[PDB]
Amino acid sequence: WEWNVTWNTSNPDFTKCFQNTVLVWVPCSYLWVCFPFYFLYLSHHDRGYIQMTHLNKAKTALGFLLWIVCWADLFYSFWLAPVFLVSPTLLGITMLLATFLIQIERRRGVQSSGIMLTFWLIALLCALAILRSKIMTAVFRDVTFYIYFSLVLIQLVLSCFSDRSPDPNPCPESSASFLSRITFWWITGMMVQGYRQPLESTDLWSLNKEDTSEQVVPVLVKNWKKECAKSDPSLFKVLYKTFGPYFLMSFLFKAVHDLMMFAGPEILKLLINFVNDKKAPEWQGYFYTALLFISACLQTLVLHQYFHICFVSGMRIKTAVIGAVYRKALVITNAARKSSTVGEIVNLMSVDAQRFMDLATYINMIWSAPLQVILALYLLWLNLGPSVLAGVAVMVLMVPLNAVMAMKTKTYQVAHMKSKDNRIKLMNEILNGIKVLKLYAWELAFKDKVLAIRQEELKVLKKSAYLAAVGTFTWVCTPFLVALSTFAVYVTVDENNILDAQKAFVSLALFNILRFPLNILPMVISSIVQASVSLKRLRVFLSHEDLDPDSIQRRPINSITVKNATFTWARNDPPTLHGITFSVPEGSLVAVVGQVGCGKSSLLSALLAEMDKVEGHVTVKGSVAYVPQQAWIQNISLRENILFGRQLQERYYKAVVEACALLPDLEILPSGDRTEIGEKGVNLSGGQKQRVSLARAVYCDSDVYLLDDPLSAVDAHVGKHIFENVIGPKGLLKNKTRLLVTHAISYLPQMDVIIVMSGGKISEMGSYQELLARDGAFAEFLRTYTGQVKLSVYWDYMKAIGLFISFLSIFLFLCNHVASLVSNYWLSLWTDDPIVNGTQEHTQVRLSVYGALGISQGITVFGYSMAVSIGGIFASRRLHLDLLHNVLRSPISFFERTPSGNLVNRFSKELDTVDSMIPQVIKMFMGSLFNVIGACIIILLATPMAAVIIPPLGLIYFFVQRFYVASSRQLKRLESVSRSPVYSHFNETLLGVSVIRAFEEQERFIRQSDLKVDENQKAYYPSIVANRWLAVRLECVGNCIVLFASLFAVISRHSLSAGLVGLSVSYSLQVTTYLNWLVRMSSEMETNIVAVERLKEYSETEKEAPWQIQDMAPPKDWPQVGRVEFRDYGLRYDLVLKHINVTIDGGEKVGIVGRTGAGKSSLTLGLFRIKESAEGEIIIDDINIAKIGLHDLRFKITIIPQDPVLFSGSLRMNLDPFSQYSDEEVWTSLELAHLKGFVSALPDKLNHECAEGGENLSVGQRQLVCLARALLRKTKILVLDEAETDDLIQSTIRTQFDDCTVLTIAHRLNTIMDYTRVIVLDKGEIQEWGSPSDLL
């Protein structure tokens, strides 16, 4: 090895000894170090054995022949040089290891191999080098090498093909070749499929076998139970032993990528030397630029497996954490669950498990970032002098800044959240009582409150804009900041230190590399600290006490046996059932009897192993069907609620439904039994749910029934019918053991056994007649009583943000990326000045200009981040104002036609992506667009010839960008829609834990939850593979431009001054990272800009008549006497109201009677103009209603609706939201409403904080509060809508409102009889018009 023939000549030939030693030791050596390690994977991972195919044999036979040929050399050598013995034998032995390896790989089922491909590639390259040398030298030993090379080439070609393999849509990962598994080509079929036709959930491939929940949840369960047995228990230790072997391969892929990333600056330093050093062989530059393409492209292929491993491991964590929490939630004791809120347990997957997946992306960087920093600091310390310390200074000041900034954000980040949270419940209230809200004209009153809370959160967002501005400045200007400090302290520390390209552009490339680790380490630290509390919560939940599975003896088919059993609701709390004993025989009806808080429901809970048994013996025999007091309704259809995951039997189902008297309920419900009952679907009355729960229990066909007050909410006739056909000895369950908790005597004599208790103690149980004869405790008890988003949407967002702010940001950021190219061009000029006297003559002026330009870069980066977030706040406030005004200035018809969920989602999620997502995405997309365009301008300007690569790369970028957008706009949309159902189902199962554990349907629910999370993963996994595909394809576009920006800089080195080449290559090096973010953010932006369109949709719908006309406004005393006249009124809805010509005189009490389907209520809607008059001229006194603005009439007429809607806040804000009426008037009205005694009782006086809908207040109180509102209004026209306190409200409406004209729509004739001039509506027509005396 000497430089004359290898380096310094025009024919770069390797020496003969080098050829025969190192070029042969490289490949053989590769297989020898990998072979042992490869058994680990081959053994731990197995997939069967591949059959005998021609390909596998072809490879094995060539491996045999190759070994022979290599040993044939040893034979000829045996037939002087020491290398002519060891090298052929070593090659033969490693070849024998190669053929054995394909053999064992066949045995272990590996269709495509990575080691058996890279090894042949390395051998091929080594053979190619020797081949070229041997063909340039020119029989004896050469022909053996030609045979070796041809066989190696054919072996390499064979190794590319994938062997035969050992539901449809199987994940192509299982059937993909290794060469296509690094380029992620197996998803390309989806990509094109994403552009031609939209993707549904039916086309996503089935989750691969390992990631499925049944494979990753049981392993975590086993590892956690093992740790608990070890007993103190830590989840981090269990998470390690579970997800550590897979995450361990991330270290190898990360470490190689880190080392290969810093090869860029080193090869750049060599290339700057080659350009600067003349008379050097040309081929040297071609070799140097070839190493810039192989190293930075292999870096892409090795980095986009670290990311894949980290993402797959995080997704596995999210799948296993969700399943483990779900499986633990079904065995947790009640006392333990009291310590955790229901919604907080759902947070264990909604945010807690998501935090682990988010962490897993960058968790492996807490060591890579310090390693990148240390290695870079070592490299640049050699590049320049000890000035690194100065740059280190800028680094040791920048990192703490980020740190505190991150912390600060987090705190008020949470603040923002809670503010939004508050608003959202308020928003719900407006969507709840919208009808009563528009009846009294409270729209303006509540719009002000929503605007106030909006301003409250907008101040926090405004501050966080400042914190994001410094975060972006530290992301962009930190590499420059370090560069400026280092260059300044280097060039001015003395006079013998100069700045040439090899000392400037290499350091610049290192600083560009160093930017990411410094600016992402604080985020990683914040994420780890945030996950430190998520881990604590997860461990706390998973370490709760488990339910005793043997406490109740569940013997399969004296039916229920309890002796000396005392139960508790908690370990330390006193017993609730003391010393209970009773024996319920098979097929007997037993009624639990007691007062409130006696311990009746506790008995049924204890028979289900819900109570904590401190002592005793319980031997419930056979299956148990539980009808809980609080009915648990699944959001599935009513049919599946009754079925409860059981085979449908038409005769049995149709015998159960009417026996519960569910036929009228089926009739009223829209779809019948297929209607979607539950909280999300149609709401059901308490009695209806009681029947449904009972119907489900009856269908379940258990032998033991525990009916914890099934007839509480059903009426007396319905209850008696139910008992007759279901629980009665002559019902459907004649031969079923029934144990019922009741407080109604009506069915007691029919009960076989009555268990009467007092204070959780058995008290003289027995049969009804015997207990009555005994005259004891029972006698006492009885005596007790889709396409591409339009640019018009972008223009709409620009109009909302403001043209001034929109154009100022673009101009000021173009200024940022113009002062950046010129500053780097100033460095190009600086590194090309004469070096006369060993001192840069113009060091002062050039350093000052560079620093001033960079400071100009420090005012424009902070200027475009302060003009995109401020604009974001300004646009969000305008969008919220417009949406609120549109919604509040619209009639009630679309409120029925448009579901409330849509509007609440628009007010919740849509406003979140406009203020907290769009400003960040637009700062990065626009930040990366000119980063690319500006980088391509320097490359093109330095070497014009680099323009014929622009056409071929433009097509690749266009076709990759279009496919990725068209396919990933839908995949994360399919993932978002499938994420909420998992949390919803977990909430549902948490609500009904006791029912699930009683019916013993735990396995079905556990499998449903894992199927739903599997459906979520089915959309999440293609989403993370799409990013890898996009990056890999566009990295090699930014990688081949590195080759071409340096190739044209090598062929034209003569017409270059070693001042542009380093600049061009340095800028091309950062093209790769900024190009995959231009496209990722071009896809997020499209799915984020659709929020503006969905937030502006209601700006184009029919609105109500103007609230204030102000041209034909009525006088202050508009209802002078209150003379109402319906002149040929007709209300469209075909006409519910028709031919209505009636006259209600001023101060004359008038009521409206009619059956269901008449226009009684619709008549009130006529008075308040809720629905526009199809044909009618209602006039109050001498003024037409249709001409008057809505608010005016709605203020001058009052209504007391069916169910009074009390809004959250104080009672005074309920009575007078505008606070227009004085405190004395409020007090007088409240006293006149029979409420003075109660309203004076609250500690908060008039400021009593009533919850959503006035849950704390009683129904009677809420009704009297609505009456107080009407009384405080002091208007001459009042309408009443009648459905205990009836005597009070009727007397109050008859007390002082005799002066005012009162219309009354009552479903009860008793009250209407008092009112004169009763109007009767048959089908909208006036059937009778006269006083009740003329009625009879």
Ligand SMILES: N[C@@H](CCC(=O)N[C@@H](CSSC[C@H](NC(=O)CC[C@H](N)C(=O)O)C(=O)NCC(=O)O)C(=O)NCC(=O)O)C(=O)O
């Ligand atoms: N040197 C790194 C290179 C990392 C790399 O090349 N890939 C980056 C791309 S820049 S990822 C960096 C990015 N930061 C920003 O771009 C924000 C900058 C500033 N806040 C502003 O507003 O301007 C960020 O926060 N990202 C987090 C996210 O994805 O949400 C990555 O993390 N890829 C993630 C992926 O592909 O999924 C390494 O060691 O590998």
